Amino acid sequence: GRLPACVVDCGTGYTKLGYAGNTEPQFIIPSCIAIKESAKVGDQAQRRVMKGVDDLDFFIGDEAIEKPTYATKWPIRHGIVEDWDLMERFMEQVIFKYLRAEPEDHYFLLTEPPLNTPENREYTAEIMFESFNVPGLYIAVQAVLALAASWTSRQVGERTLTGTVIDSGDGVTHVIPVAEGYVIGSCIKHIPIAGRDITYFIQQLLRDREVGIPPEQSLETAKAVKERYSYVCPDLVKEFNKYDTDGSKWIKQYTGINAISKKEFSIDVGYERFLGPEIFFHPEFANPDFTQPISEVVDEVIQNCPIDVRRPLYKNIVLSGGSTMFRDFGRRLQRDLKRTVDARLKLSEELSGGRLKPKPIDVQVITHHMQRYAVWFGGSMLASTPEFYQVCHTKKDYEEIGPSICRHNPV
Amino acid sequence: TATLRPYLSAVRATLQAALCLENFSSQVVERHNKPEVEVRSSKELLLQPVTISRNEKEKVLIEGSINSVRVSIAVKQADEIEKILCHKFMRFMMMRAENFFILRRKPVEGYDISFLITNFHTEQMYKHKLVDFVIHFMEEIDKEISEMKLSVNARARIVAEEFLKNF
Amino acid sequence: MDSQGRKVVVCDNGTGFVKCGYAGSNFPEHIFPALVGRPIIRSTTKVGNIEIKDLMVGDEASELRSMLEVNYPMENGIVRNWDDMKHLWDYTFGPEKLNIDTRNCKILLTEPPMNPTKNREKIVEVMFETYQFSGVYVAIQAVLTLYAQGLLTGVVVDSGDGVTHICPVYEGFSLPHLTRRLDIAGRDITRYLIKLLLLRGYAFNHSADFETVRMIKEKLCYVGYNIEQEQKLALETTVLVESYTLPDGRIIKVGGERFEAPEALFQPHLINVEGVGVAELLFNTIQAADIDTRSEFYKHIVLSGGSTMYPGLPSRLERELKQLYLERVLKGDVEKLSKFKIRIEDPPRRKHMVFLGGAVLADIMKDKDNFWMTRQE
Amino acid sequence: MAYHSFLVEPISCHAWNKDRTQIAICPNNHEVHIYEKSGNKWVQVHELKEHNGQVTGIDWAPDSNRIVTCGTDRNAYVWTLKGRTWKPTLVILRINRAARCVRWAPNEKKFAVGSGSRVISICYFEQENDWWVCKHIKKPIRSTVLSLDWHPNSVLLAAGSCDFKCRIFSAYIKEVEERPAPTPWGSKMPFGELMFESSSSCGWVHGVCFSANGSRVAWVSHDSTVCLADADKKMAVATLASETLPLLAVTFITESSLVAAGHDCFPVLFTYDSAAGKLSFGGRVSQISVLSGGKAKCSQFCTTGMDGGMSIWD
Amino acid sequence: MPAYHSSLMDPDTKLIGNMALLPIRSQFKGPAPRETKDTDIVDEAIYYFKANVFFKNYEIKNEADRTLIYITLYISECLKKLQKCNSKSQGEKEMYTLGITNFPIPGEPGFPLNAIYAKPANKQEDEVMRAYLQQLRQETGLRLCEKVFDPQNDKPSKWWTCFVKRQFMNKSLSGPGQ
Amino acid sequence: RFRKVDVGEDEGEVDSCLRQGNMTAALQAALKNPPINTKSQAVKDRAGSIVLKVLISFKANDIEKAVQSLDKNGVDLLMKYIYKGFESPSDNSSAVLLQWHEKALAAGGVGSIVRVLTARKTV
Ligand SMILES: Nc1ncnc2c1ncn2[C@@H]1O[C@H](COP(=O)(O)OP(=O)(O)O)[C@@H](O)[C@H]1O
């Protein structure tokens, strides 16, 4: 009968695949593509030239991350698709090999990062409508799906249709204010830090401190210590002193296996336990030209929103995406915000002589178990609804108007 | 019918006369500076359109103006397959118009590609090498389409082999 | 100047640029940005032999700004930093600019209309209780553009860095209830310009680079005359894409952002501001004036301040007024519009007309005491 | 070919100091640079930077030593050397579109600005305001005015235009100037009367010049044509069409010879004879001017162009 | 943004050039008075050092910041010597000979921050701040030498020598002119 | 909605010379009658068709003598007719007009073409 629409979330770290109406994605796969590298013998003078069926000799996902004779490429960068040649191939095997959905009769929900240039929406619709032959497509704003995932999962009676959603994927962090289900797009701010920058900062810091990690596995170990040993610290200068004095308890051994010799190797894990995710609060570490802490940006977003909605937003700050999963992350963000807002009120008592005391503001930062796939889940619930088939761009629309139907966006 | 050398030479001598552009601030808005061939808002600054064609299907239209010239050209889609392959080639060239500084992002209606040269391009770029690029495009375009037709035929044959050989 | 030999300085204390000089001048003697900065060390920018003093102000604080953290001491018409602003005046009357013995001078100041009263109070305070001027007068920015134009009636569209005002004046009578603010002006367009270039992939995100994008804006932006034409032209052809070199020689390409940013004056919802654009706000101001003043006001729309300088603003503004008059007064009687006499006074000297008005008024008034506040009362 | 590349970018105008020791140029921006002939090599000595948009014409008054500039910002400014630094004077130009050309009058009491506003502004000093004020020539000019030249009597002004027609106008400013003598163009010459109209109908008229006797105007057009109207044949006009690209600027060098230049990037001589009334291609970029000997008997002339740089010829 | 800034700018404390002559709790000879509180400017620098080197923008509040920054620049230099030292005894002897070398002073060429420090004009300025900066160096090196060497083996410890590469906002007190 | 308001706005001689074989004069005979002034459209299409008959029926080796017989006025007229025939393609016509172009260009140069582009009264 009626076949479920497909949901594809083209993350910068992990693409997430499945069909509408499921509580989980059917596949989580790293958004990389392995291509045959032997062309590099000729390709010394110019980029690899394809002939025959050589461009079908590629692998994606876990089939591609450690193959011995293929060069892994990472097509997506800051959420944007940077090499459409490789992404177009990546889509082919996603649809036909993994999902095994014939595109001709499945609607697609395909996610977008809020920073996406209009030109890149034209290309993505053009590939889905014209390289494939999708009957209808909907480019959906990741942040709204993340909020709805929390809305539909969280306890009844606290299902507020308003919140500030912080989405930190692997590429970029977005802070999106929502009121009554409408995105206040004017007030969006972007923080140019995410999982990659945390990984690279650990990767650099290990390569200063701990030579002996083989370069091929330098990225693997930086990723592993990040996900397993790192935490958001309470106070930086004091933490260094804690590590210097009680190093016997704070320094942790990590043991790795050599990809080639299969000898074991081991390292101390140290300051890069709390350094790393600290770059959210001190972006100047990883990024030369950004300096506002996340707990500063979030308040500037809310305090630009209409005066009525500001108080509702502080009650429902939603964390989303895997880079928000560090231990104690939300606890510190709340503390920094609370220290910022209560002082803002206290000033307005003195500038009013204490004749009236303002009601406090209840900064609350909320977290939920979907966070590895929350955007996808929010899409799969949307795509189950009958309204989705009314909202989608129908293929006939792309016949009457070109790619230009996908110029627009929430901003 | 007509050979390629006369056709290109007639185009070159025509286009060589049309690139005598000048800087010219517009009369219709306070101090905007815009190519008259595209805004067309005053008509004593537009030159007479001229056309050069070697047969009933391959034609070059030159539309001059005091500060800009638009060159729009059509190429023979001799086969059903060539219409598809030519459209894609033009689309992917036109998709990069910020790099081809003299290229429009959409064709002129009824032409396959269309260039727009401003006075600024004739001042910054070598004017004579812009003509040579239009001519070099016009020489090579059908050789390039022929190569695509062959390369698609080759792929179809190899894919057919990879199925049948398994039985 | 005075018969007492006292000079009469005119000092338009703008939120962007201080514009300064003497009575009777056809030009401001000095233009420099109302800017204050402190030295900062950065890892990226090199350090050299150009010494940065512990405080820098004005032109120097903008020219050296890469080594500085900079503040504007004044925002949206309001003094934020009574310390830094005193340093800005200390620079304005100091050796670098008007090297004046302030106790030998009369001064003419400007205030934006509808400003909060504690602002004027603190200004009048310091001009006696710190600089001790021989006399002080505060002049309204609306009438000064009329003096610079030589008129006695009009509606002033004053559009600075900080805020935009519409102010009718009829035969020298003020109509103060008709004064309308619009919360869009040149600083908001520059913040909006940043937010568009970030979408193209360029990050600026520093106080130093706030001034860099201003110089982009002034050089490259223009108000589109027929916004459907501008979007068609950008969609059809590459012509708009024009390249700018940052101070470090990075090259950036600026496209449709050239007109999408100034368009905030005509579709304020492109910024967060709820309201209507300068054209409709002006029209609704004149359609609130007393019935027979209205037909004079359409013949004397006067533009003032630097944010009016966008190429095509007078043409665009006059078209929007004709469209509204046909829609709302003539009720669609297209032929009747040919009688509608509308003039927008768009003199090339437009930017400084608030200052040139003060120069004219001070030149008229210099010996005519009973005008300046005096004896430090 | 004496040559020097000041800039790579188009030298959009130039004007020469009284003794040719200094040259004023636009470096393709809204600033004017003055260079002094520091021996064999040029050195920049001043940078006049008051304009708010690209300067489109410069002229330098040789007796009074004043520089007038106009631009697409709709400003004009008269620059006077106050001690050591050039300072501007306002022109109340009153035009609603770009200025395109400026020329001082031979008596330097007045100057004219051609513009996109379909008018010629005639400017003269108004000393009670310390600014310059305009009267507008207007009636038959249907499009923008591209180039101007003054009759040596400082009253008759010849103008070329995008509506294909060269014209002579009587710019007699009764406020500043004694009534002129009669001329072969006519005895009437109140302000703005139309003395002459071109027969042409096709190309834009890029350049216009008077002979040093004022009895002849020549113009050059986008048709790759030269014409010469002679007042003593009672305004009979010679024509010569040519095989090369259009000509952008022209000057007389004697009463019987012209030099012109165009998109062909080299100068061309056109002679004329008063007997048959025909131009002749004696043969061989953006504008031409005479360095020495004037329009009566030039000994050196110079050229600048969009291709950049300055060139001097004998 | 906010890197750590000096706490101890008492209004009683005299200035030379643009640097504050804070008291020092040192046995080395020098012109600043003897500190007696537990914290000291050299210990501020040494306590902050690990955190402070990561920040990439630094806004000078006062002359004490121009003083404390100089210490961190010198710590980021002493670590170069003592990482090579086989023993604490070698390092301590080495460090004494390091600090007495004639490092540039404000505005003398090769000094890294000529935009931000002004040269002392006179002998009683110049000689005294040399006599001050010398004893700062002497003390600063010795206080590192007490804590960078792990007491179990006099290994110059991995956790401190890790920082040798991480120059303080890319500024070297060695000076870029060499 | 304010934003959207539109506001502020011979043949009997030609075929005689051809049938006589006076082909060089048959070119002249066509060029005597330029309908430049005509407001009528169909007169222009007629005049262009008549001259095209001469250009096509000319022998290719004799085009050099034909063009060289014209004056500079005739050469500018010949170009204005050449660029017209290119807008009515036909199997033979384009091949000969591209040859007439090269010889008219050798006589008139690029300047003759500019006078086609600048011609304000379209023939
Ligand atoms: N337990 C964890 N703690 C911290 N980071 C994690 C954890 N698990 C995964 N991550 C990181 O989450 C990042 C982003 O993953 P994901 O949210 O799927 O990104 P996207 O959806 O934008 O592709 C990855 O860099 C991954 O390393």
Ligand SMILES: Nc1ncnc2c1ncn2[C@@H]1O[C@H](COP(=O)(O)OP(=O)(O)O)[C@@H](O)[C@H]1O
């Ligand atoms: N050529 C220009 N075009 C558009 N805007 C301009 C131009 N020149 C200056 N501006 C803008 O003018 C403002 C300068 O402030 P100003 O006009 O002096 O207002 P105020 O006097 O109220 O400070 C700045 O916002 C600047 O960006």
Ligand SMILES: [Mg+2]
């Ligand atoms: Mg102002």
